[PDB]
Coordinates of C-alpha atoms in Angstrom, one line a residue:
Chain A
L1 CA -10.8 3.9 -8.7
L2 CA -12.8 5.1 -11.8
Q3 CA -15.8 7.5 -11.2
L4 CA -18.7 6.8 -13.5
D5 CA -21.2 9.3 -12.1
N6 CA -21.2 12.6 -10.1
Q7 CA -22.4 11.3 -6.7
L8 CA -19.0 10.8 -5.0
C9 CA -17.9 14.3 -6.1
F10 CA -21.2 15.8 -4.8
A11 CA -20.7 13.9 -1.5
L12 CA -17.1 15.2 -1.2
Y13 CA -18.2 18.8 -1.5
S14 CA -21.1 18.3 1.0
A15 CA -18.8 16.5 3.5
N16 CA -16.1 19.3 3.3
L17 CA -18.8 21.9 3.7
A18 CA -20.2 20.1 6.7
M19 CA -16.7 20.0 8.3
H20 CA -16.4 23.8 7.8
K21 CA -19.9 24.3 9.4
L22 CA -18.9 22.1 12.3
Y23 CA -15.9 24.3 13.1
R24 CA -17.2 27.7 12.1
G25 CA -18.0 28.8 15.6
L26 CA -14.6 27.8 17.0
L27 CA -12.7 29.3 14.0
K28 CA -14.5 32.6 14.5
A29 CA -13.4 32.5 18.2
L30 CA -9.8 31.6 17.5
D31 CA -9.8 34.2 14.6
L32 CA -8.6 31.7 12.0
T33 CA -9.8 30.3 8.7
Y34 CA -10.3 26.6 8.2
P35 CA -7.0 26.0 6.3
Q36 CA -5.1 28.1 8.8
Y37 CA -6.5 25.8 11.6
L38 CA -5.3 22.7 9.7
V39 CA -1.7 24.1 9.7
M40 CA -2.0 24.9 13.5
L41 CA -3.2 21.3 14.1
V42 CA 0.0 20.0 12.4
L43 CA 2.2 22.2 14.5
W44 CA 0.4 21.4 17.8
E45 CA 1.1 17.8 17.1
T46 CA 4.8 18.3 16.1
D47 CA 6.4 21.8 16.3
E48 CA 9.3 23.2 14.2
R49 CA 8.3 21.5 10.9
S50 CA 9.8 22.3 7.5
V51 CA 7.3 23.7 5.0
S52 CA 7.8 20.4 3.1
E53 CA 6.9 18.2 6.1
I54 CA 3.7 20.3 6.7
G55 CA 2.8 20.0 3.1
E56 CA 3.2 16.2 3.1
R57 CA 1.0 15.9 6.2
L58 CA -1.8 18.1 4.7
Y59 CA -1.4 16.8 1.1
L60 CA -0.9 20.5 0.0
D61 CA 1.7 21.9 -2.3
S62 CA 4.1 24.7 -1.3
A63 CA 2.0 27.2 -3.4
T64 CA -1.1 26.6 -1.4
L65 CA 0.7 26.6 1.9
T66 CA 2.8 29.8 1.5
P67 CA -0.1 32.2 1.6
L68 CA -1.5 30.5 4.7
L69 CA 1.8 30.6 6.4
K70 CA 2.2 34.3 5.6
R71 CA -1.2 34.9 7.2
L72 CA -0.3 32.9 10.3
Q73 CA 2.9 35.0 10.6
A74 CA 1.0 38.2 10.3
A75 CA -1.2 37.0 13.1
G76 CA 1.9 36.5 15.2
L77 CA 1.2 32.8 15.6
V78 CA 4.2 31.3 13.8
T79 CA 7.7 32.3 12.7
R80 CA 9.4 31.3 9.5
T81 CA 13.2 30.6 9.7
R82 CA 15.6 29.1 7.2
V83 CA 12.3 26.6 5.8
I84 CA 11.4 25.8 9.4
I85 CA 8.0 26.9 10.7
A86 CA 7.7 27.2 14.5
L87 CA 4.9 28.3 16.8
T88 CA 5.4 31.6 18.6
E89 CA 4.5 31.7 22.3
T90 CA 1.1 32.9 21.4
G91 CA 0.7 30.1 18.8
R92 CA 1.4 27.6 21.6
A93 CA -1.0 29.3 23.9
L94 CA -3.7 29.3 21.3
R95 CA -4.0 25.5 21.6
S96 CA -5.6 25.9 25.1
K97 CA -8.4 28.0 23.5
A98 CA -9.4 25.1 21.2
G99 CA -9.8 22.6 24.0
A100 CA -7.4 20.2 25.8
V101 CA -6.1 18.1 22.9
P102 CA -7.5 19.7 19.7
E103 CA -4.9 18.1 17.4
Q104 CA -6.0 14.6 18.6
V105 CA -9.8 15.0 18.5
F106 CA -10.1 17.0 15.2
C107 CA -11.2 14.2 12.8
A108 CA -12.9 12.2 15.6
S109 CA -15.3 15.1 16.2
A110 CA -16.6 14.7 12.7
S111 CA -16.7 10.9 12.5
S112 CA -20.5 10.8 12.9
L113 CA -21.2 13.4 10.2
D114 CA -24.1 12.2 8.1
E115 CA -22.3 13.7 5.1
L116 CA -19.2 11.7 5.8
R117 CA -21.1 8.4 6.1
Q118 CA -22.8 9.3 2.7
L119 CA -19.4 9.8 1.2
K120 CA -18.2 6.4 2.5
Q121 CA -21.5 5.0 1.1
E122 CA -20.9 6.4 -2.4
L123 CA -17.4 4.8 -2.5
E124 CA -18.9 1.5 -1.4
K125 CA -21.5 1.7 -4.2
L126 CA -18.8 2.4 -6.8
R127 CA -17.1 -0.7 -5.5
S128 CA -20.3 -2.8 -5.6
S129 CA -21.0 -1.9 -9.2
Chain B
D1 CA -5.3 10.4 13.1
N2 CA -6.5 13.4 11.1
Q3 CA -5.4 12.2 7.7
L4 CA -8.9 11.6 6.5
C5 CA -10.0 15.2 7.3
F6 CA -6.8 16.6 5.7
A7 CA -7.3 14.4 2.6
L8 CA -10.9 15.6 2.4
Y9 CA -9.9 19.3 2.4
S10 CA -7.1 18.7 -0.1
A11 CA -9.3 16.7 -2.5
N12 CA -12.0 19.4 -2.4
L13 CA -9.4 22.1 -3.0
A14 CA -8.0 20.1 -6.0
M15 CA -11.4 19.9 -7.6
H16 CA -11.9 23.7 -7.2
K17 CA -8.5 24.2 -8.8
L18 CA -9.3 21.9 -11.6
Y19 CA -12.5 23.8 -12.5
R20 CA -11.4 27.3 -11.6
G21 CA -10.9 28.4 -15.2
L22 CA -14.2 27.0 -16.4
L23 CA -16.1 28.5 -13.5
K24 CA -14.7 32.0 -14.2
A25 CA -15.8 31.7 -17.9
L26 CA -19.3 30.7 -16.8
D27 CA -19.4 33.3 -14.1
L28 CA -20.4 30.7 -11.5
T29 CA -19.1 29.6 -8.1
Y30 CA -18.4 25.9 -7.6
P31 CA -21.6 25.1 -5.6
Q32 CA -23.7 27.0 -8.2
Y33 CA -22.1 24.9 -11.0
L34 CA -23.1 21.7 -9.0
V35 CA -26.7 22.8 -9.1
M36 CA -26.5 23.4 -12.9
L37 CA -25.0 19.9 -13.4
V38 CA -28.1 18.4 -11.6
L39 CA -30.5 20.4 -13.8
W40 CA -28.6 19.6 -17.0
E41 CA -29.0 15.9 -16.1
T42 CA -32.7 16.4 -15.7
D43 CA -34.8 19.6 -15.6
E44 CA -37.8 20.8 -13.6
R45 CA -36.8 19.3 -10.2
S46 CA -38.1 20.2 -6.8
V47 CA -35.7 22.0 -4.4
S48 CA -36.1 18.9 -2.2
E49 CA -34.9 16.6 -5.0
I50 CA -32.0 18.8 -5.8
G51 CA -30.9 18.8 -2.2
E52 CA -31.1 15.0 -2.0
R53 CA -29.0 14.7 -5.1
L54 CA -26.3 17.1 -3.7
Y55 CA -26.6 15.9 -0.1
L56 CA -27.3 19.5 0.9
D57 CA -30.1 21.0 3.0
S58 CA -32.6 23.6 1.8
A59 CA -30.9 26.3 3.8
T60 CA -27.6 25.8 2.0
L61 CA -29.3 25.5 -1.4
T62 CA -31.5 28.7 -1.1
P63 CA -28.6 31.2 -1.5
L64 CA -27.3 29.2 -4.5
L65 CA -30.7 29.2 -6.2
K66 CA -31.0 32.9 -5.6
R67 CA -27.8 33.6 -7.4
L68 CA -28.7 31.3 -10.3
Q69 CA -32.1 33.1 -10.6
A70 CA -30.3 36.5 -10.6
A71 CA -28.1 35.3 -13.5
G72 CA -31.3 34.4 -15.3
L73 CA -30.3 30.8 -15.5
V74 CA -33.2 29.1 -13.6
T75 CA -36.7 30.1 -12.5
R76 CA -38.4 29.1 -9.3
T77 CA -42.1 28.3 -9.1
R78 CA -44.6 26.8 -6.6
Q79 CA -43.3 22.1 -3.5
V80 CA -41.0 24.4 -5.3
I81 CA -39.8 23.5 -8.8
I82 CA -36.6 24.8 -10.4
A83 CA -36.5 24.9 -14.1
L84 CA -33.8 26.0 -16.6
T85 CA -34.4 29.0 -18.8
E86 CA -33.3 29.4 -22.4
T87 CA -30.1 30.9 -21.1
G88 CA -29.6 28.1 -18.6
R89 CA -29.9 25.5 -21.4
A90 CA -27.6 27.4 -23.7
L91 CA -25.0 27.6 -20.9
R92 CA -24.5 23.8 -21.1
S93 CA -22.8 24.4 -24.5
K94 CA -20.2 26.8 -23.1
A95 CA -19.2 24.4 -20.3
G96 CA -18.3 22.1 -23.2
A97 CA -19.6 18.6 -24.3
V98 CA -21.6 16.5 -21.9
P99 CA -20.5 18.6 -18.9
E100 CA -22.7 16.7 -16.5
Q101 CA -21.2 13.4 -17.8
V102 CA -17.5 14.3 -17.6
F103 CA -17.5 16.3 -14.3
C104 CA -16.7 13.6 -11.8
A105 CA -15.1 11.4 -14.5
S106 CA -12.5 14.1 -15.0
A107 CA -11.6 13.8 -11.3
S108 CA -10.9 10.1 -11.5
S109 CA -7.2 10.7 -12.1
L110 CA -6.7 13.5 -9.5
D111 CA -4.0 12.4 -7.1
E112 CA -5.7 14.1 -4.1
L113 CA -8.8 12.0 -4.8
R114 CA -6.8 8.8 -4.8
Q115 CA -5.4 9.7 -1.5
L116 CA -8.8 10.4 0.0
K117 CA -10.3 7.2 -1.3
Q118 CA -7.3 5.3 0.3
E119 CA -8.2 6.7 3.7
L120 CA -12.0 6.3 3.2
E121 CA -11.3 2.6 2.8
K122 CA -10.4 2.0 6.4
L123 CA -13.8 3.0 7.9

């Protein structure tokens, strides 16, 4: 609960950087940024979500989400209709370019990241002491 | 279940947002500031030591060190040792009191971090 040293924060930065590195090749191919991909994952699992529902799923506020949604719309991947975000036909087709079930294997693909195990380790060490 | 990966991204974003103002005033990026925190805790460390402390590889650390050198904050000398300059030591003062001590402590109450820890405690 309480952080007494910087190790968990350093591990958090490293783990998130490692996640970006893991997906850099694919993101480049799909022409999306990491955050944009997270939004697409949410819609591929459940389409036609309110901006609020998406934000709850990603733990992101409306202010962080709005700019990302505006960029996905500019790419012709989603449509915004009042508060409801829905994939366009091209947004639905994009899923097949990221594999068979991208929204189901996303976090599993990074489960063995050394950086993530180190992060889990730091949390354990905080608990220990 | 992708909640851990989403929580991870959100927590990192929240940390960046928390320190955005400070970083602008120090003219540093987030990763560059992390390197300074390590050096402020203890100076004259090898690139290998710094990497182990930050859980980063030399490749990721090289660009960061180059920008800190350009800012005249650290010097690099042959292992390779990174040492703070007079400007690097003086910078600590502008980041405030005991910057290397309150950094992660200040994140203790960040909601996004509490959420991440909740998911981390399932693995």
